[PDB]
Amino acid sequence: ARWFPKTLPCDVTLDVSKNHVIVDCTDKHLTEIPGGIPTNTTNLTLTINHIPDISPASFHRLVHLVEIDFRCNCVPMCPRRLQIKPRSFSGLTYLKSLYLDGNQLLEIPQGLPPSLQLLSLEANNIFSIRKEQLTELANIEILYLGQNCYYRNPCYVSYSIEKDAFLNLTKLKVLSLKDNNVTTVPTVLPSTLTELYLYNNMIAEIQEDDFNNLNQLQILDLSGNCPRCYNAPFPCTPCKNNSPLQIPVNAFDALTELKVLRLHSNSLQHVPPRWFKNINNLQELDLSQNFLAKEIGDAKFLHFLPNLIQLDLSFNFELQVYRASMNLSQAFSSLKSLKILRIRGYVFKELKSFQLSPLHNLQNLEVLDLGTNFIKIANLSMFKQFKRLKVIDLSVNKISPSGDYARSCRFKNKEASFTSVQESCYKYGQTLDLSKNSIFFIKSSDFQHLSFLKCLNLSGNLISQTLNGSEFQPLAELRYLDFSNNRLDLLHSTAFEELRKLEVLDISSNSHYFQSEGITHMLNFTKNLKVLQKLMMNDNDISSSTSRTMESESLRTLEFRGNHLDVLWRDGDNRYLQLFKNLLKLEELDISKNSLSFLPSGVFDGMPPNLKNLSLAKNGLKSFIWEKLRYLKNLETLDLSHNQLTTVPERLSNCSRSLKNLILKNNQIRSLTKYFLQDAFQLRYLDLSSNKIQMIQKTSFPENVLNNLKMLLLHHNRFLCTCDAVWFVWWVQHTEVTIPYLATDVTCVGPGAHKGQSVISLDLYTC
Amino acid sequence: ARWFPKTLPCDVTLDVSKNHVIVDCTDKHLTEIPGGIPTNTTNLTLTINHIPDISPASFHRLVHLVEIDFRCNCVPMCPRRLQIKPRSFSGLTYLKSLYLDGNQLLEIPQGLPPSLQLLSLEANNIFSIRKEQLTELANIEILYLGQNCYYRNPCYVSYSIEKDAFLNLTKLKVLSLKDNNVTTVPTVLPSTLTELYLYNNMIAEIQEDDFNNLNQLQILDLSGNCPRCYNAPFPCTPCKNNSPLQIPVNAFDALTELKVLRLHSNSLQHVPPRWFKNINNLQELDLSQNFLAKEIGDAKFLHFLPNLIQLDLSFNFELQVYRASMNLSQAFSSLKSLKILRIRGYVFKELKSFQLSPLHNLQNLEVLDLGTNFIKIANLSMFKQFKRLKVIDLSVNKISPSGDYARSCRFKNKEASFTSVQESCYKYGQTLDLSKNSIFFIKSSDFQHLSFLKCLNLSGNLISQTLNGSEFQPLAELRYLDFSNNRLDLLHSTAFEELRKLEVLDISSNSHYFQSEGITHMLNFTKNLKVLQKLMMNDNDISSSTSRTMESESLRTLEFRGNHLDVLWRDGDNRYLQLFKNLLKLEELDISKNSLSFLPSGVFDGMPPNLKNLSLAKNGLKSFIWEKLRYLKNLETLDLSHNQLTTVPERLSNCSRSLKNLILKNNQIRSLTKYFLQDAFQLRYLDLSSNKIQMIQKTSFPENVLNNLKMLLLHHNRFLCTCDAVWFVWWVQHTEVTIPYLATDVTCVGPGAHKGQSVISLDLYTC
Ligand SMILES: *[C@@H]1O[C@H](CO)[C@@H](O[C@@H]2O[C@H](CO)[C@@H](O[C@@H]3O[C@H](CO[C@H]4O[C@H](CO)[C@@H](O)[C@H](O)[C@@H]4O)[C@@H](O)[C@H](O)[C@@H]3O)[C@H](O)[C@H]2NC(C)=O)[C@H](O)[C@H]1NC(C)=O
Ligand SMILES: *[C@@H]1O[C@H](CO)[C@@H](O[C@@H]2O[C@H](CO)[C@@H](O[C@@H]3O[C@H](CO[C@H]4O[C@H](CO)[C@@H](O)[C@H](O)[C@@H]4O)[C@@H](O)[C@H](O)[C@@H]3O)[C@H](O)[C@H]2NC(C)=O)[C@H](O)[C@H]1NC(C)=O
Ligand SMILES: *[C@@H]1O[C@H](CO)[C@@H](O[C@@H]2O[C@H](CO)[C@@H](O[C@@H]3O[C@H](CO)[C@@H](O)[C@H](O)[C@@H]3O)[C@H](O)[C@H]2NC(C)=O)[C@H](O)[C@H]1NC(C)=O
Ligand SMILES: *[C@@H]1O[C@H](CO)[C@@H](O[C@@H]2O[C@H](CO)[C@@H](O[C@@H]3O[C@H](CO)[C@@H](O)[C@H](O)[C@@H]3O)[C@H](O)[C@H]2NC(C)=O)[C@H](O)[C@H]1NC(C)=O
Ligand SMILES: *[C@@H]1O[C@H](CO)[C@@H](O[C@@H]2O[C@H](CO)[C@@H](O[C@@H]3O[C@H](CO)[C@@H](O)[C@H](O)[C@@H]3O)[C@H](O)[C@H]2NC(C)=O)[C@H](O)[C@H]1NC(C)=O
Ligand SMILES: *[C@@H]1O[C@H](CO)[C@@H](O[C@@H]2O[C@H](CO)[C@@H](O[C@@H]3O[C@H](CO)[C@@H](O)[C@H](O)[C@@H]3O)[C@H](O)[C@H]2NC(C)=O)[C@H](O)[C@H]1NC(C)=O
Ligand SMILES: *[C@@H]1O[C@H](CO)[C@@H](O[C@@H]2O[C@H](CO)[C@@H](O)[C@H](O)[C@H]2NC(C)=O)[C@H](O)[C@H]1NC(C)=O
Ligand SMILES: *[C@@H]1O[C@H](CO)[C@@H](O[C@@H]2O[C@H](CO)[C@@H](O)[C@H](O)[C@H]2NC(C)=O)[C@H](O)[C@H]1NC(C)=O
Ligand SMILES: *[C@@H]1O[C@H](CO)[C@@H](O[C@@H]2O[C@H](CO)[C@@H](O)[C@H](O)[C@H]2NC(C)=O)[C@H](O)[C@H]1NC(C)=O
Ligand SMILES: *[C@@H]1O[C@H](CO)[C@@H](O[C@@H]2O[C@H](CO)[C@@H](O)[C@H](O)[C@H]2NC(C)=O)[C@H](O)[C@H]1NC(C)=O
Ligand SMILES: *[C@@H]1O[C@H](CO)[C@@H](O[C@@H]2O[C@H](CO)[C@@H](O)[C@H](O)[C@H]2NC(C)=O)[C@H](O)[C@H]1NC(C)=O
Ligand SMILES: *[C@@H]1O[C@H](CO)[C@@H](O[C@@H]2O[C@H](CO)[C@@H](O)[C@H](O)[C@H]2NC(C)=O)[C@H](O)[C@H]1NC(C)=O
C-alpha cells in the first residue's frame, strides 16, 4: 500500500493480488538504510552496499516485512565484518525469509523470530555448529550454511558439528553444507529432510547408519568428495592413494523416495548394483568425472533403474589411453524411461553403428550427448534409426567427411539444477549439432539418409567451399541451417537453392571471402529461397556486391551488422542505394556497426515499404537527416544509440507519423528543439540517456504527450540544476512517468555546491 | 667523394673500394628534387614522393650517376601521371640501371643513354610494344615490363606486341612479362635470353616454334595461364571448359640449358614424358596448383629427371574427393639428386609406412613437406628410416595420438625465387614440425624409435597435460622443444626432467593454467635441466608461483614478457624479490609488458650477478630509481622504451659504470639534468626520441663524451627553436655524431613562424 513514496532511491513494485510490496535497493552504494521506508512493504532488498552494521531501530517501525535480503554486504577492499546488535530481529513477527550471505559473520545471529522459515548464511566465517544457537531455529525449513570454508574463503579448520545438532529441527526440509570442509556427515539428521547438499566437501567415508532415518529424502548430493583432480583448474586435494569415496553396499537402504542422486567427481571405480536395490523411483543419476570407463562396458547396476530419466556419464576417460571405440554395455536397454544421456569425455577414435545398438530400443530417448570425444571416423548415416531423437550432439570432436561480487551475491534460487543451454535451433525439431568439427568440405553423399533433420549446426568447422546448389540435397526437410565461422564463397546465385523448406539461414563470420575485392558476391541468392524468414549475415565485412539488389518475397528479418555499408553507399555511387527495396515482406533491419559516417540522400526512399524495426547503433552518424523519415510509413522502433548525432529534429510529428520507440542512448546532444515533442501523440518510448543535454524547456515536453509515455530515460547526463529549470525540477518530482535511476544516476553538474545533487531531491525555495 | 654534405635530407653512404656513393631519399615527401646533390654520387634513390614531373635540368650536373630509382612516385589519391621531358636522360653517359615503376607512364620513355643495362617499367600503363621505341634499347640486358594490365591495374585491352619486337635486342638476358594480359608468346625472342617470365598471363596455347631459338634459356615461368580458379581469393578467369594449358610434346626441344621450370597453377591434367626428353639438366620443377592427382600415381615423366633438385606438387587435390591414402608412384625412386619434396594439398586420410617406400632410397633427400593434408592416422614410428632427413613437415593436418604502396615499391630484386621460411629450429638438426595438429595428450610410446630427433615443434596443438617427467622419454637427443599455444600444467617440478640434452625450451602462450590462482606453479623446474641455455615463457600471465626462486646453473637467456610481475612484486610482499637471483649464468632478461607501475626497492639486489641485457619496455614505469643500478656491475643494454618515466638520473656515471646502450624511446621526459652525461665515457649508444624534451644545455652534453657515441637519436620530439639553444643549434649542424632523421623527423615547435623548421637548416643571425 501507501502507493506514493517521497524520496526512496529504490524501485517499488505493488502486487494487490499477492499483497506484496517489493523494495529493491540493489547496487545503490547506500552507507545507511534510507529513511521514509514504507511500513506496508513485505520484501526488502539490501544487497551489495556499504552498510557498517545492523541496529534494532533499523526495522523498528517495519512489522509487515516477510523477506529481508542482505547478500554480499561486505565481500573480502571491505571494512571490518558486519556486527548485529542483540534483539535486532525479534520485532519482525511476520518475518519468514532472511538472507545474510557474504557478511563475514563469525557466529549464527541470535534473537531470530520463531516465524522464520528460510535462513541463508553462505560465504561467512561460521565453522562451528552447536545446538545452543540452533535451539531458536526450531521452526526453520530451509537452511543454507555452505561456502563457509573452502579454497575461495579459507578458514584452516575442519568443520565441527556437535552430536545431534540438527536432530531437533523437526520442520527442516532442505539442508546445504557445500564447500564447508566437512569431514563426517552430521548425524543424526532429522527424518523430515528432503534435499541434502553435502557436495564439495572432504568426506572420505560413509557409515551404514548415516542415512538410516532419512525416508522422505528426494535429492542427495555427494559430489567433490575425493574428487578427480587431474587437469583441475582450481585448487583441489585428491584423497590419499587416489582412494575412491568409500560407500557401503547397504548405504542407500532407508532411502525410498529418492529421485536425484549426484555422485559427480568422486573418483569412483565400481558401481555395485546393491546401491540401487531399494531406490526404485530414482529419476536423475549423475556419475560424471569418475573413473568408470571400465564400468560402462559392464554397467551391471543399470538393471535396477527402470524409471531413470537422466543419466550423466561425462568425462570418465582413462589417463594416457585412447580407446578405439565406445564400449556401451548391453544393459543400457533396460533404461525404458531414459530421456537424456550424456557420454561426453569418453574420448575414443571411431564410432560405429553397432556400438549404439543398446540405445535402439529406447522409445523415450530424446537427447544423446556425444560431444568432446575426439571422434575421428563417424558414419552419419547410422543416425537414420534415431528419428525419434530430438537433439543429437556431435560437438568439438574431430568428425571429418567420409573418405574413399561472488556467486552468493546473485541467484536467489541458491541450490538449483544445471539448466541446459537452450539453443535457438532446438525448437525447430531434430537437431544435429555438428559444430566445431573437422569437416572441411560438404558432400551430398555424407548427409544421405538424413531427410528427417529439421536443424543443422555447422558453426566453427572452417569450411572453404563454393556451393552451387547440390551439397545439401538430401536435407529436404531442413528448416534451420547454421554456417557461422566458416569460409563461404558466394560465387553463384544458386547457393542453398535445393533447401526448399529452409526458414532461417546464418552465414555470419564469413569475412574471409567477403573481404576480398573484385570477386563476384551474388547477394541475390535469397530469391530462390521461397519460405526464408530470417537471414543473419552479420560480421561479414561485406564491402562490394555484384548483384545490384537483394530479392526475397518472404524474408522478414535481416541482420546486416558489422559490415562495410559506407563503401557500398559511398558518395557518387548510387548503384546500391535500393539494395533492400525488393525485400517486400521485410519488417526488421539491423544495419549497425557499419562505420556509416553519414546517410546519403535516397537510401530512405530505397528502404522496404513494410519496414518496422530499424537499428543504426554504434555507427558514428555525424549528421542524420530527419525529414526523410516521412518515406517510411511503418517505422516504429528507430534506434540510433551509441552514435555521434548532435541535433534532434525540429518537429517529430512532421518527421514520422508512427514512430513510438525512439532511442538515442549514449549520444552527444547538448540541447533539444523548442517543439521536439509537439503533437507527437503516437510516441510511447523515448530515450535520451548518456547525453550532454543541459536543460529541458516546458514548450518542448508537453504533459499531454508525456502522460501516455510508458518509459523515459534521462540518466547519466550533464543536466545543470540552476534556477532556469524550475519547471523541469517541479515536473520531474510530480509526474508518474516511469523514469529509472531517478535518484541514483541522474545528478546535477552545478552550480558550485550542487555537484552530485539528486534532481528529485531538489527544492529551490529561493527560486 | 665530397664527404661533407650541407643540407641533404637523404642518407649518404661511401664505399671507397667500390667507388660508389649512395643517396637514399626513401619516404621523405619531397615535392621536388633537393638542391646541393653531390656530383660524385652513383646511386640515386627517389622512391615514393610527390614529384610532379622530370626535367632535363634535374640531372644536368650529375654525370657520374649509374643508378636512378623512381619506384612508386605516383600510386593510383595521386595527381596526373608523371611527364618526362624529351632528352631528360641523354646526359647520363655512365647510367647503367634505371627504375621507373609505379609512374603511370603511357609509353616507353625515349632518349635513354646507350649505356643502359637495366630498365624497369612495372606498374605502368604501357600495353603496346613496337620496335621503334625499342630500337634505342639495343644495349639493354634486363627488361621488366610486367604488371601493366591485370586485376589490380586494369587496362581492358589485351597486350599487343608487334612481330620481332625483341629480336634485335642482342644483349637481352632477362625478360619479364608477368600480369600483362598477354595472349600469345611474343615471337621471336632473342637467342641470348636466359630468364623468361611469362606467368600470370592469358596465354592459352603454345606453338611448337615458340622456343625454337632459345638455347641458353635457364629459367622459364608459365604460371597463371589457364589457372586453377577454385577457391581463389583473387579475381581470376578460368579458361573455357576448364581446358588446360595446351603445350605440345615437342615444345621444350631447343631448351638444353634449362634449369628452372615453373608450371604452377596451369590446370594441367597429364604430364607427358616427351616434354623432359631434351632437358636433362633440369634442377627445379614446379607443378603445384594443378589437377595432377591421378598423374602422381603414375608419374611416368619422373624417369627423365635424374638431376632434379626441387620438386613441388602442392595443392593438387580433387574436388569433392577425400583419398584414403597417398598414392606415390614407384617412379619416385629415379630422383637420385632430389633434395626438397613438397606434397602439400594432397589431402588424404591415412599415411602408412609402405606409402613412403619410393622415397626410402633417396640419399640426398633433406626436406619432406607434408603439411596441410588433413592426415588423420599417422604412425610416427615410420619415420625411423628417414634419419638422413633434415626437416619433416607434419603441419596443420589432423594427426592425433595413436589409439588402442605496392609490390614494386619495394624488393629491388624483382624476380626472385620463393625464399623458404627459415625457422629457428632448423639449425639444430633433424626437425619434426608437428605444429597445429590434433594431438591432445603425449605418450612415451608414440615418440618411440625417434631418438635421432634434435628438434620438435608442438605449437598450437592445445595439449592439456600435467607432465611429471616421463612423456618425452625416448627423445634422448632432443635439443629444441616448442610448446607454445598449449595448456601446460606445472604442478610438478620434475617436468622435462628426462630431456637431458635440451637447450631451448619454449612454453609461451600457456596462459590457461597460469591464470588460475591457488594452484601450484613449480617455477624451479629448470634446476634439473643441466644444459638449458634459453627459456622463453612469455605471454603466460604468470601471477603467482609456489617456488620462491628459480634455479638454473646454465640458463643464459630468459624471456618473461607479457606476464604479471606487479602482483609478484606487490608492495609488502618480499617473497619473490630474489626470483632471478639463483640464475648464476643468466645474461639477458626480457621482463617487459608486465604492467610494472614501479620497481620495489630490493629487486636490483636480487638480480643475477652476470646480467648484461635488461629490458623493461612497455611497462609503464611511473618512477624508476637510478641509484640502485650500481648493484648491477655488468649491465650494458638497459632498455626503458615506451615507458612513462619523467626524470633522468642526476649523474649517469654515478649510477652505472658499464652502461653503454641506454634506450628511452617513446618516453615522457621534459628536461635533462645539468650533469646527465658527466664523465660517462663508457657509453656508446643513447636514445631520447619521441619525448617531450624542450632544450639541451652545453654542460649536460660534453663533446668529449659525444665524440665516442656511435649513434644518438633526438627525433620526433618537442624541441623549441628559440634563442636560448644557440649552442645546441651550432653543435647539431657541426658534429659527426650519427643522428638519423636529422632533417625529416626532428622539427621545431616554435616560436611562431618557426613551426616545422629543420634544426639542421637553422641559422639565427639575430641571436
Ligand atoms: C517476497 O518474499 C516472499 C517470501 O518472503 C517470496 O515468496 C516465496 O516465493 C517462492 C517462489 O518464488 C516460493 O517458493 C515456492 O516453492 C515451492 C516448492 O517448489 C520447489 O521446487 C521448485 C522446482 O519444482 C523450485 O523451483 C522451488 O524453488 C522450490 O525449491 C513451489 O511449489 C511454490 O510454487 C513456490 O515456487 C516461496 O514458498 C515463497 N515464500 C513464502 C514464505 O511464501 C516472494 O517470491 C518474494 N518476492 C520477490 C519479488 O522477491
Ligand atoms: C648501386 O647501383 C649499382 C648499379 O648501378 C649496383 O650494382 C649492382 O649490384 C648487383 C648486386 O647487388 C649486381 O648484380 C649481380 O648479379 C650477378 C648475377 O647473379 C644473378 O643471380 C643471383 C642468384 O645466384 C641473383 O641474386 C642476382 O640478382 C642475379 O640475378 C652476380 O653474379 C653479381 O655478383 C651481382 O650480384 C649488378 O650487376 C650490379 N650492377 C652493375 C651495373 O654492376 C649496386 O648494387 C647499387 N648499390 C646500392 C647500395 O643500391
Ligand atoms: C580444511 O580443514 C583441514 C583440516 O585438517 C585444513 O588442513 C589444515 O590446514 C592448516 C593450514 O594450512 C594446517 O596448518 C599448518 O600446520 C603446519 C605444521 O604442521 C604449519 O607449518 C603451517 O604453516 C600451517 O599452520 C594444518 O596442518 C592442516 N591440517 C592437517 C591435518 O593437515 C585445511 O586447511 C582446511 N581447508 C581450508 C580451505 O581451510
Ligand atoms: C551452433 O554451435 C555453436 C557452438 O557450439 C554455438 O555457438 C555458441 O553459442 C553459445 C550460446 O549462444 C555461446 O555462448 C555464449 O557465449 C557468450 C560469449 O561469446 C556469452 O557472453 C554468453 O553468455 C553465452 O555463454 C557460445 O559463445 C557460442 N560459441 C561460439 C564459438 O560462437 C551456436 O549458438 C550454435 N547454433 C545454434 C543455432 O544452436
Ligand atoms: C585483358 O584483355 C581482355 C581482352 O579481351 C579484356 O577483355 C575485355 O574486357 C573489356 C572490359 O570489360 C570488354 O569490354 C566490354 O564490352 C561489353 C560489350 O561486349 C560492354 O558491355 C562492357 O561494358 C565492356 O566495355 C571486352 O569485351 C573484353 N574482351 C572480350 C574479348 O571479351 C580484359 O578486360 C583484360 N583484362 C584486364 C584486367 O584489363
Ligand atoms: C612451430 O610452428 C609454428 C606454426 O607452424 C610456428 O609459428 C609461426 O611462426 C612464423 C614464423 O615466425 C610466424 O610467421 C610470422 O607471423 C607474424 C604475424 O604473427 C608476421 O608478422 C611475420 O612476418 C611472420 O610471417 C607465424 O605467425 C607463426 N604462427 C603462429 C600460429 O604463431 C613456430 O615458429 C614454429 N616454431 C619453431 C621453433 O620453428
Ligand atoms: C567391453 O567391456 C566389457 C566389460 O568390461 C568387456 O568384457 C570383459 O572383458 C574382459 C577382457 O577380455 C574379460 O576379462 C571380462 O571377463 C569381460 N567381462 C564381461 C562381463 O564380458 C569387453 O571385453 C569390452 N569390449 C571391448 C571391445 O572393449
Ligand atoms: C554409412 O552407412 C551407409 C548405410 O549403412 C552406407 O551406405 C551404403 O552405401 C553402399 C554404396 O553406396 C551401398 O551399396 C549400400 O547399400 C549402402 N547401405 C545401405 C544400408 O543402403 C555408407 O556406405 C556408409 N558410409 C561409409 C563411408 O562406409
Ligand atoms: C554444381 O557443382 C557440382 C560439382 O562440380 C557439379 O557436378 C559436376 O558437374 C559436371 C558437369 O556436369 C560433371 O562433369 C561432374 O561429374 C559433376 N560432379 C559430380 C561429383 O557429380 C554440378 O553439375 C553443378 N551444378 C550446377 C547446376 O552448376
Ligand atoms: C543475381 O544477379 C546477377 C547479376 O548481378 C545475375 O547474373 C546474371 O544472370 C543473367 C541471366 O543468366 C546473365 O545474362 C548475366 O550475364 C548475369 N550477370 C552476371 C554479372 O553474372 C544472376 O542471374 C542473379 N540471380 C538471381 C537468382 O536473380
Ligand atoms: C595409384 O595410381 C596408379 C596410377 O594411376 C593406379 O594404377 C592404375 O589403376 C587404374 C584403376 O585400377 C587402372 O585402370 C590403371 O591401368 C592403373 N595403371 C597402372 C600404371 O597401374 C593405382 O591403382 C593407384 N592405386 C591406388 C591404391 O589408388
Ligand atoms: C607403429 O610402427 C611400429 C613399428 O613398425 C609399431 O611397433 C610395434 O609394436 C608392437 C607392440 O608394441 C611390437 O610387437 C612390434 O615389434 C613393434 N614393431 C617393431 C618393428 O618393432 C607400432 O605398434 C606402430 N603403431 C601402431 C599404433 O600400430
Ligand SMILES: *[C@@H]1O[C@H](CO)[C@@H](O[C@@H]2O[C@H](CO)[C@@H](O)[C@H](O)[C@H]2NC(C)=O)[C@H](O)[C@H]1NC(C)=O
Ligand atoms: C621446487 O620448490 C618446491 C617448493 O616450492 C619444492 O617442493 C618441496 O620439496 C620438498 C622436498 O621433497 C618437500 O619437503 C616440500 O614439502 C615441498 N614443498 C612443496 C610446497 O611442495 C620442490 O622440491 C622444488 N623442486 C626442485 C627441483 O628444487
Ligand SMILES: *[C@@H]1O[C@H](CO)[C@@H](O)[C@H](O)[C@H]1NC(C)=O
Ligand atoms: C522491434 O524490436 C524490438 C527489439 O527489442 C522489439 O522489442 C519490438 O517488439 C520490435 N517491434 C516489432 C513490431 O517487431
Ligand SMILES: *[C@@H]1O[C@H](CO)[C@@H](O)[C@H](O)[C@H]1NC(C)=O
Ligand atoms: C510541419 O508541420 C506543420 C503543421 O502540421 C505543417 O504545416 C508544415 O507543412 C510541416 N512542415 C514540414 C516540412 O513537414
Ligand SMILES: *[C@@H]1O[C@H](CO)[C@@H](O)[C@H](O)[C@H]1NC(C)=O
Ligand atoms: C643485448 O641485446 C641487444 C638486442 O638487440 C643486442 O644487440 C646486444 O648484442 C646484446 N648484448 C649482449 C652483450 O648480448
Ligand SMILES: *[C@@H]1O[C@H](CO)[C@@H](O)[C@H](O)[C@H]1NC(C)=O
Ligand atoms: C657522485 O659522484 C661523485 C664524483 O665521483 C662522488 O664524489 C659522489 O660520492 C657520488 N655520489 C653518489 C651518490 O654516488
